[PDB]
Amino acid sequence: REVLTGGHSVSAPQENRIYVMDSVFMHLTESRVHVYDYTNGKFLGMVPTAFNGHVQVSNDGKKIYTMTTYHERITRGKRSDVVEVWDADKLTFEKEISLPPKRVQGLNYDGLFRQTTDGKFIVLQNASPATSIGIVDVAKGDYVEDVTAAAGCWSVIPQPNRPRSFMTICGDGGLLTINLGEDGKVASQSRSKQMFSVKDDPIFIAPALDKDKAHFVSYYGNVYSADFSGDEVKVDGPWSLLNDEDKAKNWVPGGYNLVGLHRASGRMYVFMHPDGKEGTHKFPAAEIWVMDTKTKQRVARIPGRDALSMTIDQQRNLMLTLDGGNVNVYDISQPEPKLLRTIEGAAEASLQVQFHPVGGT
Amino acid sequence: REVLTGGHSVSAPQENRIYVMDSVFMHLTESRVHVYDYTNGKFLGMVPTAFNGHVQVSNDGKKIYTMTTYHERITRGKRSDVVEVWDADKLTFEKEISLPPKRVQGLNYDGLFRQTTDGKFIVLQNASPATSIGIVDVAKGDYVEDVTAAAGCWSVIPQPNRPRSFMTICGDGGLLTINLGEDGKVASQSRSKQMFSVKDDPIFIAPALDKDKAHFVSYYGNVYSADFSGDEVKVDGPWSLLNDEDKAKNWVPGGYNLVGLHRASGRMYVFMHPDGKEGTHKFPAAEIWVMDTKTKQRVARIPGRDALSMTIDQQRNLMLTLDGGNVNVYDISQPEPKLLRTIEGAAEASLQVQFHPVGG
Amino acid sequence: SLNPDLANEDEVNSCDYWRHCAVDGFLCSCCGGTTTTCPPGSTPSPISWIGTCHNPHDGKDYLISYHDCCGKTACGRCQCNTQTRERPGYEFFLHNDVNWCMANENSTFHCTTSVLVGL
Amino acid sequence: EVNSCDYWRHCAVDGFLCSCCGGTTTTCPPGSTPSPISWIGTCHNPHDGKDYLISYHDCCGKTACGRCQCNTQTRERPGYEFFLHNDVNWCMANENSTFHCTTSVLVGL
Ligand SMILES: NCCc1c[nH]c2ccccc12
Ligand SMILES: NCCc1c[nH]c2ccccc12
């Protein structure tokens, strides 16, 4: 009567999909991506990612990229670090791209595994523990070479106003910009002036990323900016997120992927908690603050639902937040966010959620 | 100035150690063995066992044997089914033994991964899904025999009174006995008469194993026995675990590794629950019943603590029970078991616990 | 009652649904598939354990085939462990304590289901 | 007290305490290998009132211990100050990079 079949595509359209990167820290060799429909909370499928997987969706929306580590016998034998290309609609494996055995192993900050604006290169963090940036040529299915200029730096911030350029944060408190050639090798580079004091006002690595600038928040609740509208990056700050009352109750940022920018309005979203002191920079959000980056004033504050990470969709005016296991969906078309729903049990140990891309040319 | 070091041995003596096989069913590719001290509940170490590991300790107490499956890329690529030999004191990997890609993938019943009494051969269940028994020669590190005569049978019951003999339960309701030669190849075999009706009174596979006989309980609370004091196994039963009051409340056995035998007394331990009916054969224990296998009568009953699996240590007169996550330790030196302690959170999803062997 | 796709999703996703009477695993219908389709990127087992379940809606008894979907790691959702008419491994194809993905190209178990074979 | 996340020496542990895993504060559980490299934390000793350097070496080559998970962040800094950073696997350069548990090794003042 009935016959069980495979070969099926994900049941909901791409524009409904989100990706919850479950580290499964208790069993970190069985990390996976959980695919959910944000419109109704339905579980749609998953992609296995072995030991401490990282994930992104191709800018064109067609493929899912994962990065992971295998060994021949898991806890012994030869190491293979790889990028894998998966079909986004069938959730099937297509291609493995070999990496040098030094891809970053760590929690899922966005900037560890990114791509150029044009989608042509995957750009990833290496640590041996010496740091460099790895470049993967998507068309060729090849590793290009290490960006050794990025030694002593950390994380990848693509420049959305150029096809194959990105920046990284360096130990001198400035930014290194890398411009790739068509072959994925470094064509040119430049280093900014000092943006922030590493000792006195360290910044969180997560950018609030606009098309031609990026903002960063600090451990003490200051904001720094990098303008890359020109070939040379211009840096500024600090300004404070905090008014007098805020300072009196020691409000400071905290989380992992803890900020976001709504590009059309210039609204910046930040997880914040009171009673800040040394050691609280990864505390869950007591609140989300919504800052106008032009006026440099807060325009809203709402309950944080113990969130640690977020992401913003520019095309549908949404923000997702994530507390490690549950995902909250917000409408951010107005200054005050509105909670639409919560997806309970989306992961066991996730610090990263991402939308399936829509548009974005 | 302190220095971090490796290379250390397990901190408690072998005689204190138990092995909790955690399937981690929610993340079955990261199954593992957790090693505990039963005397105080201390976590001593662990052995990773990849996808659905099985485990046993060598009869001489020196090594841990695991059985598992790998693939080149876990969820794709070539399959490798293996036995691994680990040092018991250092909890380090020593050797891989290749198996054909048909080792049983399934929950951890004892009888799926055993060894001969003399410790020279590992005896494991295969399913392709056609069933056969595989023989690994420990000294050589090789898979040496595939017992296809055991097709249609399931699980391995070693005979403790012979060096390289074991039995398996067959679809005819009888037992097939295999006697291995010193090369690990079949030297002789025999089939018993029908012991139980497969259709009308199926038995649980878990034996209550004595030196020269084994007892089995059925889905309806009967007991069957296999006497292997001779070369030919003699079979008998049923006798009922149940008296008339028991029958009125529909008591039946339930669990996985659900029975055990205290050899010095002949006491058999069985997990039981009331309100039995079709489909309740894996229900947690409401009670543990203690049966005198010579008089064929119950002697005691105690609360079951929702246990599912057990094991017995003869020389220290102990019984462990396991509910999936927690291990209960009992003194069984007297007919009524006495609860000594509970080890909470020993596993996420375990249906098998075993003592370190101390007899040599 | 014979067509889960027409039924209430919460009804078919329950361990108590009549046709799930010997399921041991995660229901595929909670894992991005349906009762009769593997979630994307998982492969049906060509072999299975079997048995009958009683349909209380129409009063008839049906042959059910419990195929797994394979080659992805554990789904983790809607775990069931029902045992009506289930028997040990000496009645192998009635037995559900084994991985029915055991003969697939990749034996990693993702989810299970209950395929209606016939009366 | 050493098995508690609040023990003073554990002020920048992000991981499972090896002392709950069959090891000790300064020795890996059997069959796991120490990382040669580590992040460092500066922790306040509540007895003498002085700050000490604590080297957080991971133990490697076995799967996650799962016991006594801690996430403390005193003086911890992001990956642009790499050896003060604890959101990475300090087993990254071992023969096998699978992370088992973390030790808290006192270096000195
Ligand atoms: N030292 C702990 C680093 C860590 C936190 N979460 C993770 C996930 C994957 C790998 C490392 C981590
Ligand atoms: N059909 C599920 C079989 C099963 C139950 N527990 C297990 C543990 C490991 C492998 C299979 C199983």
Side-chain angles (χ1 to χ4, degrees), chain A residues 1-198 200-231 233 235 237-293 295-361, chain B residues 1-244 246-360, chain C residues 2-8 11-119, chain D:
Chain A
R1 170 159 174 159
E2 289 178 350
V3 181
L4 178 61
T5 56
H8 303 285
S9 299
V10 171
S11 65
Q14 290 185 174
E15 60 269 25
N16 288 12
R17 307 184 198 161
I18 66 173
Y19 298 93
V20 182
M21 181 57 244
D22 198 350
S23 72
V24 193
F25 193 77
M26 293 285 289
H27 301 291
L28 186 53
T29 65
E30 210 188 88
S31 71
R32 71 276 290 290
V33 193
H34 291 337
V35 191
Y36 273 98
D37 185 326
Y38 78 84
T39 68
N40 63 11
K42 182 185 192 170
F43 184 84
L44 301 174
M46 61 92 72
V47 178
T49 57
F51 181 76
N52 179 41
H54 288 241
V55 65
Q56 68 189 132
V57 188
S58 65
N59 289 342
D60 72 8
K62 297 185 165 173
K63 303 300 172 180
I64 296 167
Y65 304 140
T66 67
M67 175 173 67
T68 187
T69 293
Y70 300 94
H71 301 255
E72 309 173 286
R73 291 287 184 273
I74 309 171
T75 46
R76 63 187 171 85
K78 191 189 187 176
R79 186 162 162 178
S80 295
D81 287 359
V82 305
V83 163
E84 300 182 353
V85 182
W86 290 66
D87 191 64
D89 294 345
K90 293 303 189 185
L91 301 181
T92 47
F93 168 77
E94 296 183 342
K95 192 170 67 187
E96 174 178 304
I97 299 167
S98 299
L99 310 176
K102 63 181 176 191
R103 71 88 177 182
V104 58
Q105 297 177 162
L107 79 84
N108 296 276
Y109 292 101
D110 282 0
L112 301 177
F113 187 53
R114 298 281 79 187
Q115 70 201 100
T116 49
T117 298
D118 69 5
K120 291 303 186 177
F121 298 99
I122 286 163
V123 185
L124 64 91
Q125 182 64 242
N126 292 323
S128 77
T131 76
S132 61
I133 288 169
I135 306 298
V136 163
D137 182 321
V138 169
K140 285 188 193 166
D142 283 349
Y143 188 78
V144 179
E145 68 194 8
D146 299 351
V147 176
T148 55
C153 309
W154 197 246
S155 91
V156 178
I157 305 95
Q159 290 188 159
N161 63 335
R162 293 186 181 90
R164 54 190 180 261
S165 301
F166 59 87
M167 313 170 292
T168 184
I169 307 167
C170 299
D172 67 356
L175 304 174
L176 171 61
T177 289
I178 301 293
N179 307 297
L180 306 178
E182 287 183 51
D183 56 4
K185 307 183 185 199
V186 177
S188 65
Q189 65 196 250
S190 62
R191 184 177 293 265
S192 77
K193 304 175 195 167
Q194 195 199 72
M195 182 168 69
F196 69 96
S197 167
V198 170
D200 299 335
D201 205 20
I203 55 161
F204 289 84
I205 62 163
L209 189 60
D210 209 344
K211 189 178 194 176
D212 69 7
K213 66 184 80 71
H215 317 274
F216 302 91
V217 305
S218 83
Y219 279 38
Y220 303 107
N222 295 318
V223 184
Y224 292 89
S225 290
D227 181 308
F228 49 92
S229 52
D231 284 345
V233 181
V235 296
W239 57 276
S240 192
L241 297 167
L242 310 186
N243 68 30
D244 278 10
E245 301 158 60
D246 299 332
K247 298 174 181 167
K249 282 147 184 191
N250 292 302
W251 284 87
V252 296
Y256 292 92
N257 292 300
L258 85 169
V259 299
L261 190 82
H262 187 256
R263 292 182 185 173
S265 62
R267 286 192 297 270
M268 180 172 71
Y269 297 79
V270 194
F271 296 139
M272 303 289 292
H273 63 275
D275 306 327
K277 70 195 70 230
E278 179 61 64
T280 79
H281 51 285
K282 291 162 191 179
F283 274 22
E287 297 185 334
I288 312 170
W289 292 9
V290 186
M291 311 300 303
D292 185 311
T293 53
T295 69
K296 300 181 186 180
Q297 304 296 125
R298 195 173 62 212
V299 294
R301 66 198 299 184
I302 63 163
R305 305 184 68 84
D306 290 324
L308 287 162
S309 290
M310 67 166 68
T311 190
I312 306 293
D313 196 88
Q314 312 301 152
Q315 287 72 35
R316 279 75 53 81
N317 306 300
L318 302 171
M319 170 176 60
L320 304 171
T321 72
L322 167 65
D323 65 15
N326 314 301
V327 175
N328 303 293
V329 187
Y330 295 86
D331 167 12
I332 60 163
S333 61
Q334 310 299 135
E336 183 161 76
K338 301 173 172 173
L339 183 64
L340 302 186
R341 70 184 56 74
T342 301
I343 309 176
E344 314 284 355
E348 292 178 87
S350 182
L351 292 170
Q352 190 194 220
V353 58
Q354 297 172 269
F355 287 90
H356 203 286
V358 173
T361 296
Chain B
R1 199 253 193 186
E2 300 181 339
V3 187
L4 178 54
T5 57
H8 299 289
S9 300
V10 172
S11 62
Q14 288 187 174
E15 70 210 22
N16 287 12
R17 305 183 199 163
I18 65 172
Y19 297 85
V20 178
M21 182 59 242
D22 197 350
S23 73
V24 195
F25 190 77
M26 292 284 289
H27 300 290
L28 187 56
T29 65
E30 208 187 272
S31 69
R32 73 271 296 284
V33 191
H34 295 332
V35 190
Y36 276 93
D37 186 322
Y38 76 84
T39 69
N40 64 10
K42 183 176 185 187
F43 188 89
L44 299 177
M46 46 165 292
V47 180
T49 58
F51 183 76
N52 179 44
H54 292 241
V55 67
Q56 62 184 137
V57 185
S58 67
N59 287 343
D60 67 10
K62 297 181 180 285
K63 305 292 176 191
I64 295 170
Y65 304 141
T66 68
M67 176 171 66
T68 189
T69 293
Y70 299 94
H71 296 261
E72 298 170 295
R73 295 280 187 271
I74 309 169
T75 46
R76 61 190 175 81
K78 191 190 179 186
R79 182 162 165 177
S80 297
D81 286 1
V82 303
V83 164
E84 300 185 351
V85 179
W86 293 63
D87 189 67
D89 286 346
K90 293 298 186 191
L91 303 181
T92 46
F93 168 77
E94 298 184 339
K95 181 163 78 175
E96 180 175 304
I97 301 170
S98 308
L99 309 180
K102 58 178 186 175
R103 70 91 180 177
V104 58
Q105 294 179 166
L107 87 79
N108 295 276
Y109 290 104
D110 285 353
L112 296 180
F113 190 51
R114 298 280 84 185
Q115 68 198 100
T116 52
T117 298
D118 71 0
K120 293 191 164 179
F121 299 99
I122 286 165
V123 185
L124 62 98
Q125 182 64 249
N126 292 316
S128 72
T131 77
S132 68
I133 291 171
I135 312 296
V136 164
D137 179 323
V138 180
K140 295 181 187 159
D142 291 328
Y143 190 90
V144 295
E145 173 68 291
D146 201 297
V147 188
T148 51
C153 310
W154 197 244
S155 88
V156 179
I157 302 108
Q159 293 186 162
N161 63 341
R162 291 187 179 89
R164 300 174 299 283
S165 297
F166 61 87
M167 307 171 299
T168 185
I169 300 162
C170 296
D172 68 348
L175 299 173
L176 169 67
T177 295
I178 300 293
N179 309 299
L180 301 176
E182 298 175 60
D183 53 2
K185 293 188 177 196
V186 177
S188 64
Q189 65 194 256
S190 62
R191 294 290 283 258
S192 76
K193 294 175 193 175
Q194 185 185 84
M195 177 171 69
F196 67 103
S197 170
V198 169
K199 289 302 129 190
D200 294 345
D201 197 21
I203 57 161
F204 292 83
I205 64 165
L209 187 56
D210 208 345
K211 189 149 180 206
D212 66 350
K213 55 187 85 179
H215 316 274
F216 300 89
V217 300
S218 86
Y219 275 42
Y220 302 110
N222 297 314
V223 188
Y224 294 86
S225 297
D227 183 308
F228 52 89
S229 55
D231 294 329
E232 303 298 287
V233 183
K234 299 169 177 183
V235 298
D236 77 81
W239 57 270
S240 181
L241 295 169
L242 314 177
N243 63 34
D244 281 356
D246 299 330
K247 289 186 206 167
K249 286 213 172 192
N250 291 305
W251 285 89
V252 299
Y256 291 91
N257 292 300
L258 85 175
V259 296
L261 189 78
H262 181 258
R263 293 185 186 171
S265 65
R267 288 188 290 270
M268 180 175 71
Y269 298 83
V270 189
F271 296 138
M272 301 292 291
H273 59 273
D275 306 321
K277 61 182 199 153
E278 182 64 63
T280 78
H281 50 280
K282 294 163 188 175
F283 275 25
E287 292 185 341
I288 307 172
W289 290 12
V290 185
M291 315 296 300
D292 184 322
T293 57
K294 303 174 226 194
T295 66
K296 304 174 169 35
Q297 305 287 307
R298 189 179 60 217
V299 298
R301 64 203 300 186
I302 61 159
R305 307 183 68 82
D306 293 317
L308 287 164
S309 288
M310 64 169 69
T311 194
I312 309 289
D313 188 85
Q314 302 308 149
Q315 295 204 100
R316 279 73 58 77
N317 295 317
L318 300 167
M319 171 173 62
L320 309 171
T321 71
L322 166 61
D323 64 17
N326 313 303
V327 175
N328 305 293
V329 185
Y330 295 86
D331 162 30
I332 62 168
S333 61
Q334 302 307 149
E336 184 187 71
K338 182 61 166 188
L339 183 63
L340 304 180
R341 70 188 63 81
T342 297
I343 304 175
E344 309 281 8
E348 287 179 89
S350 179
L351 295 168
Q352 189 199 221
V353 59
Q354 295 173 269
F355 286 92
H356 211 286
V358 299
Chain C
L2 308 175
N3 296 291
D5 294 353
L6 308 172
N8 202 95
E11 169 175 31
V12 316
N13 290 348
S14 173
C15 292
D16 295 338
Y17 189 53
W18 73 269
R19 63 158 71 196
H20 294 329
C21 78
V23 167
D24 177 12
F26 307 112
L27 299 174
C28 290
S29 63
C30 297
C31 296
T34 67
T35 301
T36 58
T37 59
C38 284
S42 67
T43 298
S45 65
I47 50 176
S48 65
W49 61 91
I50 59 162
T52 53
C53 300
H54 179 71
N55 183 348
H57 307 277
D58 76 2
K60 297 174 175 219
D61 288 324
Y62 291 86
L63 299 171
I64 304 301
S65 191
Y66 303 98
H67 292 262
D68 291 333
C69 297
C70 310
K72 282 188 162 174
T73 43
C75 165
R77 289 136 173 85
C78 297
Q79 190 172 175
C80 297
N81 187 37
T82 182
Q83 300 293 152
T84 299
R85 283 176 287 282
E86 189 273 359
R87 297 294 187 263
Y90 55 78
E91 299 177 74
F92 201 56
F93 295 95
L94 292 179
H95 185 227
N96 75 9
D97 295 334
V98 293
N99 175 25
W100 280 112
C101 289
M102 67 182 83
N104 274 243
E105 191 178 353
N106 188 266
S107 51
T108 306
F109 168 73
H110 179 57
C111 64
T112 169
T113 197
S114 311
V115 186
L116 195 162
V117 170
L119 273 162
Chain D
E1 95 180 305
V2 306
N3 293 348
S4 165
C5 296
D6 299 325
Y7 178 59
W8 76 272
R9 302 196 198 200
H10 301 326
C11 80
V13 176
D14 171 16
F16 308 108
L17 300 176
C18 291
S19 62
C20 299
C21 298
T24 69
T25 307
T26 63
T27 61
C28 286
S32 66
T33 299
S35 61
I37 53 171
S38 64
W39 67 90
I40 304 299
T42 294
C43 302
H44 180 74
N45 182 327
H47 308 298
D48 67 16
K50 293 170 180 161
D51 282 6
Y52 289 80
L53 297 167
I54 309 305
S55 187
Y56 297 102
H57 291 264
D58 289 333
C59 295
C60 314
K62 283 189 169 175
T63 46
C65 170
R67 287 135 179 83
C68 298
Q69 193 177 170
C70 295
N71 190 39
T72 309
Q73 302 291 151
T74 294
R75 284 179 130 96
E76 191 272 354
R77 294 295 183 273
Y80 58 76
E81 311 180 61
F82 201 50
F83 298 94
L84 303 181
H85 188 227
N86 73 11
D87 296 333
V88 293
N89 181 20
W90 281 111
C91 288
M92 65 183 88
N94 273 239
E95 194 148 14
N96 190 265
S97 57
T98 304
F99 165 75
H100 183 57
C101 63
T102 303
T103 61
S104 302
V105 181
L106 186 298
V107 172
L109 281 168

